[PDB]
Write a protein that holds these residues in place. Structure first.
Motif, PDB file in Angstrom:
ATOM      1  N   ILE A  20      70.953  61.899  72.540  1.00 38.09           N
ATOM      2  CA  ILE A  20      70.211  60.911  71.759  1.00 38.09           C
ATOM      3  C   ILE A  20      70.229  59.558  72.457  1.00 38.09           C
ATOM      4  O   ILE A  20      69.198  58.889  72.585  1.00 38.09           O
ATOM      5  N   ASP A  21      71.409  59.127  72.901  1.00 40.10           N
ATOM      6  CA  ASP A  21      71.529  57.833  73.557  1.00 40.10           C
ATOM      7  C   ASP A  21      71.214  57.891  75.044  1.00 40.10           C
ATOM      8  O   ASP A  21      71.302  56.858  75.716  1.00 40.10           O
ATOM      9  N   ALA A  22      70.866  59.057  75.575  1.00 44.23           N
ATOM     10  CA  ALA A  22      70.234  59.131  76.883  1.00 44.23           C
ATOM     11  C   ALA A  22      68.721  59.046  76.787  1.00 44.23           C
ATOM     12  O   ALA A  22      68.051  58.979  77.821  1.00 44.23           O
ATOM     13  N   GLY A  23      68.174  59.043  75.576  1.00 45.71           N
ATOM     14  CA  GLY A  23      66.740  58.955  75.397  1.00 45.71           C
ATOM     15  C   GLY A  23      66.004  60.258  75.599  1.00 45.71           C
ATOM     16  O   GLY A  23      64.983  60.279  76.288  1.00 45.71           O
ATOM     17  N   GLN A  24      66.496  61.351  75.024  1.00 48.85           N
ATOM     18  CA  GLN A  24      65.906  62.665  75.219  1.00 48.85           C
ATOM     19  C   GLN A  24      65.649  63.346  73.883  1.00 48.85           C
ATOM     20  O   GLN A  24      66.535  63.436  73.032  1.00 48.85           O
ATOM     21  N   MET A  25      64.424  63.831  73.712  1.00 54.56           N
ATOM     22  CA  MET A  25      64.053  64.669  72.583  1.00 54.56           C
ATOM     23  C   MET A  25      63.744  66.061  73.096  1.00 54.56           C
ATOM     24  O   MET A  25      62.681  66.284  73.678  1.00 54.56           O
ATOM     25  N   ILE A  26      64.657  66.996  72.880  1.00 46.69           N
ATOM     26  CA  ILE A  26      64.476  68.372  73.315  1.00 46.69           C
ATOM     27  C   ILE A  26      63.747  69.118  72.210  1.00 46.69           C
ATOM     28  O   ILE A  26      64.166  69.082  71.051  1.00 46.69           O
ATOM     29  N   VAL A  27      62.642  69.771  72.556  1.00 46.52           N
ATOM     30  CA  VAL A  27      61.817  70.502  71.602  1.00 46.52           C
ATOM     31  C   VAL A  27      61.775  71.960  72.033  1.00 46.52           C
ATOM     32  O   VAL A  27      61.534  72.251  73.209  1.00 46.52           O
ATOM     33  N   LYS A  28      62.010  72.872  71.095  1.00 38.79           N
ATOM     34  CA  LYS A  28      61.911  74.304  71.358  1.00 38.79           C
ATOM     35  C   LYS A  28      60.731  74.872  70.585  1.00 38.79           C
ATOM     36  O   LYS A  28      60.696  74.788  69.355  1.00 38.79           O
ATOM     37  N   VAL A  29      59.766  75.435  71.307  1.00 37.46           N
ATOM     38  CA  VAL A  29      58.566  76.032  70.733  1.00 37.46           C
ATOM     39  C   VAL A  29      58.435  77.440  71.296  1.00 37.46           C
ATOM     40  O   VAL A  29      58.628  77.647  72.496  1.00 37.46           O
ATOM     41  N   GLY A  30      58.125  78.406  70.441  1.00 41.83           N
ATOM     42  CA  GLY A  30      57.932  79.788  70.857  1.00 41.83           C
ATOM     43  C   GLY A  30      56.551  80.283  70.466  1.00 41.83           C
ATOM     44  O   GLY A  30      55.979  79.823  69.481  1.00 41.83           O
ATOM     45  N   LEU A  31      56.022  81.215  71.249  1.00 48.39           N
ATOM     46  CA  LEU A  31      54.686  81.745  71.034  1.00 48.39           C
ATOM     47  C   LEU A  31      54.709  83.254  71.220  1.00 48.39           C
ATOM     48  O   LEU A  31      55.612  83.807  71.847  1.00 48.39           O
ATOM     49  N   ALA A  32      53.702  83.923  70.670  1.00 49.47           N
ATOM     50  CA  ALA A  32      53.567  85.371  70.815  1.00 49.47           C
ATOM     51  C   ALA A  32      52.093  85.677  71.048  1.00 49.47           C
ATOM     52  O   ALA A  32      51.342  85.889  70.093  1.00 49.47           O
ATOM     53  N   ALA A  33      51.690  85.718  72.312  1.00 49.22           N
ATOM     54  CA  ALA A  33      50.287  85.879  72.666  1.00 49.22           C
ATOM     55  C   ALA A  33      49.893  87.352  72.622  1.00 49.22           C
ATOM     56  O   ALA A  33      50.705  88.238  72.347  1.00 49.22           O
ATOM     57  N   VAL A  34      48.625  87.621  72.919  1.00 51.49           N
ATOM     58  CA  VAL A  34      48.043  88.954  72.833  1.00 51.49           C
ATOM     59  C   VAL A  34      48.066  89.585  74.218  1.00 51.49           C
ATOM     60  O   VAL A  34      47.982  88.885  75.233  1.00 51.49           O
ATOM     61  N   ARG A  35      48.233  90.889  74.259  1.00 50.94           N
ATOM     62  CA  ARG A  35      48.139  91.568  75.541  1.00 50.94           C
ATOM     63  C   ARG A  35      46.884  92.411  75.581  1.00 50.94           C
ATOM     64  O   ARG A  35      46.513  93.003  74.560  1.00 50.94           O
ATOM     65  N   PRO A  36      46.204  92.500  76.715  1.00 49.30           N
ATOM     66  CA  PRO A  36      44.982  93.295  76.770  1.00 49.30           C
ATOM     67  C   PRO A  36      45.274  94.773  76.965  1.00 49.30           C
ATOM     68  O   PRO A  36      46.373  95.180  77.341  1.00 49.30           O
ATOM     69  N   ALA A  37      44.253  95.585  76.699  1.00 54.32           N
ATOM     70  CA  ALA A  37      44.327  97.036  76.837  1.00 54.32           C
ATOM     71  C   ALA A  37      43.747  97.416  78.194  1.00 54.32           C
ATOM     72  O   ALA A  37      42.530  97.440  78.376  1.00 54.32           O
ATOM     73  N   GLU A  38      44.621  97.729  79.144  1.00 56.04           N
ATOM     74  CA  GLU A  38      44.161  98.015  80.495  1.00 56.04           C
ATOM     75  C   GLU A  38      43.637  99.436  80.628  1.00 56.04           C
ATOM     76  O   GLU A  38      42.677  99.682  81.363  1.00 56.04           O
ATOM     77  N   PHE A  39      44.263 100.391  79.952  1.00 58.31           N
ATOM     78  CA  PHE A  39      43.968 101.803  80.142  1.00 58.31           C
ATOM     79  C   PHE A  39      43.430 102.391  78.850  1.00 58.31           C
ATOM     80  O   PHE A  39      43.828 101.969  77.766  1.00 58.31           O
ATOM     81  N   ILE A  40      42.487 103.315  78.965  1.00 61.82           N
ATOM     82  CA  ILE A  40      41.958 104.067  77.834  1.00 61.82           C
ATOM     83  C   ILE A  40      41.798 105.503  78.290  1.00 61.82           C
ATOM     84  O   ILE A  40      40.962 105.785  79.147  1.00 61.82           O
ATOM     85  N   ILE A  41      42.571 106.417  77.732  1.00 61.83           N
ATOM     86  CA  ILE A  41      42.458 107.781  78.222  1.00 61.83           C
ATOM     87  C   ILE A  41      41.741 108.609  77.168  1.00 61.83           C
ATOM     88  O   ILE A  41      41.805 108.324  75.971  1.00 61.83           O
ATOM     89  N   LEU A  42      40.996 109.602  77.635  1.00 66.52           N
ATOM     90  CA  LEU A  42      40.062 110.366  76.815  1.00 66.52           C
ATOM     91  C   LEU A  42      40.401 111.841  76.921  1.00 66.52           C
ATOM     92  O   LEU A  42      40.225 112.443  77.982  1.00 66.52           O
TER      93      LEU A  42
END
Lengths: 148, 148, 352, 401, 175, 148
Positions: free
Chosen positions: E146-168
């Motif tokens: 705090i007295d070093a002048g630092q605001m540590i922020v933790k943010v997390g995300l959960a993005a989408v993954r694409p579908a590379e393969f489609i088997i028939l």
């Protein structure tokens, strides 16, 4: 993206390739519809799905009303054609407007024939503006710009 | 004989000490009121008798936050003056009950995308000892309530 | 399963997977598994969520195994996730397992286990098979006493046969599908008889009505048989005991489906301060469950005071010595529906 | 750094909640390694997850025995699950040896010096480590000391069966199997990196092997947060049971109802898995003789710990005042004004507050002339607690009318 | 293509499977059995023409083959998030570093990520499996920070993954 | 079981087996009706009960309106066919949505011919969104999923 609002518009007329910039103040404009006429043909043993055959395109009819104002080159045009003098064409450019008064999209209505012209009724009992419900039939419509 | 650390975790918190943050500014208001989270209800009843109730559409949110005028500061008017035809610079409002000096927040309300309507200029009368007080009734969406 | 190298489409074939749709219900058949099966470990209960998950386990399908033709006919009719437990460790795993409402003898003999496992306190309702040989009117006293007289079991005699199988298909396979397909459609209180069998299942032995007149009395043996109008169907709704309290399976299966959903409705009352405001919070958590069961037609009667009753309180049902022992005694009564087994048709010739 | 502005960085760490509560303060005696000071502080007060990372390792203490059977200590992981279920500011007592008699016998001498501890946990798997600690800690379970509820663990269904069989103990049978993983660290393997080239590549492969498996922990650490979570919600007087554990995977054992009927009467509680609700703590008894029905529950033992722990705090304004009649009428009013608030919050069963408590102090009511002339004051507090409902019986009849 | 897809489908959709305008055509024809070896490890995305649509992009893999940053839409979303978080809460610079600065920061992030949540940019179904913003003294920052002048922020995300393969899978025998 | 609500939906178009994922935001969709046409034949001495003979199936007409937005591959399709250039077909996939934005049921509307296209009217006197009431005739409808 985000939709636009329907109370900024101007419509300018083109009388024999001479523009008419005096007559852009209108109360409302009818909104431009076109329709592909369709003849349904049912056939044979296919009695579980329809079969539509295209036909000619039927353009709408453009009505636009304004408060009655001092006489203008728009009014001299309708009075000339609806008194049987001269059957002449006039091109209409109807455009939406932005916040900075820039056009978003414009509809050019080529060879629009002035069909009818109707004022509102006088009445002593109610207070309202006399309007000029004047309606003209165009024969082609060419949309131009962004945000149709 | 309760201590001052049990009061800060058991006893409820009073309304008369809060700070409002409009966008990135801190404007000291007098009375903020009218924020809520409402829903409409859908009923469906059928035959043998089943009275299904589901909550439906989220209902609109317009909050009303009130401020006395100050001799140099003109802050709420230049937000209701900033609107040309279709868009305002929408801000976000954070309301938060505080400590005595604003060193701690105790419970925080966040308002997502707020644009102003209906700025009411003060009511002048020469028989009242009031302070010239104006109010702003900004419509928004998604009021959430955040602890600490 | 093919390995994937390039992003695109793969055209790999897989002949004859015999694929069925995944289903969700509340009926969970513990399947008894014979000890010579290899893709099971004992003192372990593996779970089969759909027919593709069983087919992932065994690899490929063969119509020789008495289990393989059993779980296909189960997922072809009703579906729902099932527990495959080997027989020699079935007495340890079923008290361990929650979500157990019916124990299926797949093709094995469980009559020694059900006597110790199925109790009034538990929540099971076992089903097992009739004899796989033909039985007549003359042998009605011999095969009837081969089963015990507990009211927590039902017996279906005619073993099935299908075009896709070689060994005969045991009827407790399909009857766990029927118990799970009827509870979703018509609820628990309707009888699981008079319903069709899907999957191309057909009975092995033709049953007459004069044969079924002797296997419906006493330790009853329900029977399935085909008719001219609809095809093969189930034609029994009697349990083994022939007292009027538990004579029909819909009565026994409702009271077992009630208790498993009361004890999770008021499971908040555990280790709560045992005084009076715990009690009326308990009698109200039961009473608006039974009312919601009342409105769906699950209980008989016409009012809510001929239908059920919940009565607790100090001195009404529990003594003062039961309070400081940590006991809340609850008395709940129900009045379920009974099915119409017989319909007689009187043919007068002279109209008035 | 060195310049103002935003500094985006990826692959961050995990942070938890603080959840402060000064009533159930546990102490974690186990295999921890300090990293920042390494020297003098025999046990450290942490307040949340961040003071743990700023002082300790986040590394399991690997322990190898030479053909080799290995052991990984879950004390760092078992403390993550304490902050995930509940919270608090636990003292951490790192103890790696557990065979030095000069250090192990001074565990009660340093844990009474701090005067804030109520719970006593041990997050380790090893029997020869854990049962050496419980014998040293068992001096706190005497009647000479107050508080100090030892929440313990049995590795099997049988009782821990020591001299700590007193009413101040509770055991929780099934070991949990948490879904987290490790990130890894016989007489200093770097020495053996030079001598035996064949064993070095052998042990380095097994460390990567046991890195992939989910770690099993004892529940003596997870219920230490459950004891705090039901203390903020419902206070001490409610039973720390019928509440779901969070963050764990499956259990290690799947104990049913008929095996539980001996363990619970023995005094071993059990985490029992119901599918529709989760992993609920099931049982609120204590490791006591089953004939003693007075202290036969956790909260009846744990409230009486917490009342006298806050009565000593309230009576400290009395001690070195003079010994006469106006000193007793202030000390009697201090416990009367304390017990009235416990009667308010429904901690004591009763209808009118002369039944829920009574304090009797006086010249001839409790003392003598030679009693006061020595300089001591005796009063008799007594209070009636609420007993929870373990068993319920549902009696399904069929004849409604 | 990276600028034409971010306007149309947003950042989180893969910039592959899109056509090339301007009359652009690939020099060398690529087979699928060739692309099976350049997709593993240090991947080389490839563009190639098809019979139905014409030339198109056919890769959405970055160079690293760990599951954290394997697809470019994951790496490009986290890079498009950070440039729009650090301008969303750039008001916090040289502000009094106490608690009312912090909840004004965690709320300026949280109704950005919610507006990104509703457009389908993150995976999940609730707003509490989607992201989290956690700051506070002792939660993420120490008193010496705090007295070093630092605001540590933790943010997390959960993005989408694409579908590379489609088997028939082509069964011949219909049930 | 329990009924579903009618304000989560998306409709995606398929232009020559190339999907169109830019145009899923619509204000309303008409709801899909199909009808078996019936010729009643009354006969002979049977004058106490009717006798209906089946005929071909008549599918409905799908209207769907949206706010007017930036120009898109949907708008370039209608403008291409209603300016007489190319009579082309487009397949429409209309699906309901769950709470987790999963589809409950989907209607695939094969070979839907774009018939008409109509904007709302401009008017200066009232504040409303310009919408695009665009209506297209499909020739088959194949319902697919659970909860029809």
């Amino acid at each position: 993206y985000t939709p636009v609002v329907s109370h900024r518009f101007m419509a300018s007329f083109i009388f024999n390739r001479i523009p008419d910039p005096l007559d852009i103040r209108f109360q409302r404009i009818s909104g431009l519809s076109r329709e592909l006429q369709v003849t349904q043909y049912s056939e044979g043993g296919e009695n579980a799905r329809n079969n539509y055959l295209a036909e000619k395109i039927q353009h709408g009819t453009l009505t636009l009303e304004r408060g009655v104002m001092t006489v203008s080159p728009l009014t001299w045009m309708f009075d000339r054609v609806l008194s049987g003098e001269k059957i002449a064409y006039a091109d209409v450019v109807v455009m939406l407007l932005n916040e900075n008064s820039l056009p978003l999209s414009s509809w050019t209505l080529s060879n629009a024939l002035p069909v009818r012209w109707q004022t509102s009724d006088f009445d002593a009992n109610s207070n309202a503006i006399l309007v000029n419900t004047l309606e003209l039939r165009y024969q082609d419509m060419r949309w131009l710009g962004v945000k149709i | 004989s309760t201590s001052t650390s049990q009061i800060a975790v058991e006893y409820p918190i009073p309304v008369y000490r809060f700070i409002v943050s409009v966008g990135d500014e801190k404007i000291p208001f007098n009375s903020v009121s009218g924020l809520d989270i409402s829903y409409d209800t859908i009923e469906y009843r059928d035959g043998v008798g089943n009275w299904f109730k589901m909550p439906g559409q989220s209902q609109s949110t317009n909050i009303t936050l009130r401020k006395g005028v100050f001799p140099g500061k003109t802050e709420l008017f230049d937000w209701i003056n900033s609107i040309q035809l279709n868009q305002v610079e929408k801000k976000d409002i954070t309301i938060s009950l505080t400590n005595d000096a604003g060193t701690e927040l105790l419970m925080t309300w966040n308002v997502s995308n707020a644009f102003p309507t209906s700025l009411t200029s003060p009511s002048f009368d020469a028989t009242s000892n009031d302070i010239a007080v104006q109010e702003i009734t900004l419509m928004a969406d998604r009021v959430i309530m955040q602890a600490v | 399963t093919t390995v994937t190298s390039y992003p695109g489409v793969y055209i790999e074939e897989l002949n004859s997977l015999a694929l069925s749709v995944s289903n969700s219900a509340t009926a969970v058949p513990v399947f008894a598994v014979d000890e010579q099966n290899q893709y099971i470990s004992e003192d372990n209960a593996i779970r089969i969520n759909s027919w593709m998950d069983y087919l992932n386990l065994i690899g490929n399908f063969n119509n020789e195994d008495k289990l393989d033709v059993s779980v296909r006919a189960y997922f072809a009719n009703g579906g729902g996730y099932c527990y495959l437990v080997k027989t020699t460790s079935l007495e340890k795993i079923i008290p361990t397992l929650d979500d157990v409402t019916l124990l299926v003898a797949a093709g094995e003999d469980i009559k020694t286990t059900v006597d110790v496992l199925c109790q009034p306190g538990k929540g099971l309702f076992a089903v097992f098979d009739g004899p796989e040989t033909e039985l007549t009117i003359n042998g009605a006293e011999e095969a009837k006493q081969a089963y015990t007289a507990t009211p927590f079991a039902a017996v279906y005699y005619p073993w099935l046969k299908a075009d896709w199988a070689n060994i005969d298909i045991p009827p407790s396979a399909v009857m766990a599908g029927v118990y799970a397909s009827v509870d979703l459609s018509r609820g628990v209180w309707k009888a699981p008889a008079n319903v069709a069998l899907k999957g191309g299942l057909e009975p092995k032995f033709l049953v007459t009505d004069e044969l079924q007149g002797e296997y419906n009395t006493g330790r009853a043996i329900n029977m399935i048989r085909n008719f001219s109008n609809t095809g093969t169907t189930v034609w029994g709704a009697r349990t083994l005991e022939d007292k009027d309290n538990w004579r029909y399976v819909p009565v026994r299966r409702l009271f077992n489906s009630v208790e498993r959903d009361i004890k999770r409705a008021m499971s908040f009352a555990m280790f709560e301060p045992n005084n009076q405001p715990t009690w009326e919070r308990v009698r109200a958590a039961i009473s608006n469950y039974l009312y919601s069961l009342w409105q769906q037609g699950g209980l008989a009667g016409s009012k809510e005071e001929d239908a059920y009753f919940v009565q607790i309180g100090k001195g009404i049902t529990m003594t003062q010595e039961q309070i400081d022992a940590g006991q809340m005694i609850v008395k709940v009564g129900l009045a379920a529906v009974r099915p119409a087994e017989f319909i007689i048709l009187q043919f007068t010739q002279d109209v008035e | 750094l060195k310049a103002p502005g935003v500094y985006i960085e990826e692959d961050a760490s995990l942070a938890l909640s603080v959840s402060n509560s000064a009533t159930a303060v546990p102490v974690f005696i186990g295999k921890f390694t300090p990293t920042v000071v390494d020297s003098i502080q025999v046990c450290t007060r942490i307040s949340n997850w961040l003071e743990f990372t700023s002082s300790f390792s986040l590394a399991p203490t690997v322990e190898i025995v030479v053909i080799e059977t290995i052991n990984l200590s879950p004390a760092v992981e078992a403390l993550r699950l304490y902050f995930q279920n509940g919270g608090g500011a636990c003292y951490i007592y790192p103890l790696n040896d557990a065979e030095d008699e000069l250090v192990l016998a001074a565990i009660p001498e340093v844990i009474e010096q701090k005067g804030d501890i109520t719970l006593l946990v041990c997050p380790e798997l090893d029997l020869d480590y854990k049962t050496k600690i419980y014998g040293a800690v068992s001096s706190l379970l005497n009647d000479n000391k107050v508080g100090y509820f030892l929440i313990a663990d049995s590795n099997d269904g049988e009782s821990v069966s020591g001299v700590w069989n007193s009413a101040k103990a509770a055991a929780y049978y099934p070991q949990l199997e948490t879904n987290l993983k490790f990130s890894t660290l016989p007489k200093n393997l770097d020495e053996l990196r030079t001598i035996n080239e064949a064993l070095a590549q052998d042990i380095d492969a097994r460390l990567l092997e046991e890195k992939q498996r989910a770690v099993i922990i004892p529940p003596s650490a997870a219920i230490a947060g459950i004891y705090c979570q039901t203390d903020n919600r419902r206070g001490v007087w409610k039973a720390p049971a019928n509440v779901a554990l969070t963050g764990i995977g499956s259990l290690l054992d799947k104990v049913d109802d008929e095996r539980q009927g001996e363990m619970n009467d023995k005094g071993i509680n059990v985490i029992r898995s119901f599918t529709d609700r989760g992993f609920m703590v099931w049982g609120a008894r204590t490791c006591v003789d089953a004939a003693n029905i007075s202290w036969r529950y956790i909260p009846v033992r744990r409230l009486f710990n917490s009342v006298e722990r806050d009565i000593r705090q309230a009576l400290r304004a009395v001690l070195f005042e003079t010994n006469s009649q106006p000193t007793w009428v202030r000390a009697k009013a201090a416990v009367d004004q304390y017990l009235y608030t416990l009667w308010q919050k429904n901690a004591l069963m009763g209808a009118r507050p002369e039944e829920a408590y009574f304090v009797q102090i006086g010249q001839d009511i409790t003392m003598s002339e030679a009693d006061i002339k020595q300089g001591k004051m005796i009063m008799t507090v007594g209070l009636a607690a609420v007993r929870p409902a373990e068993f319920i019986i549902l009696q399904f009849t069929q004849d409604v009318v």
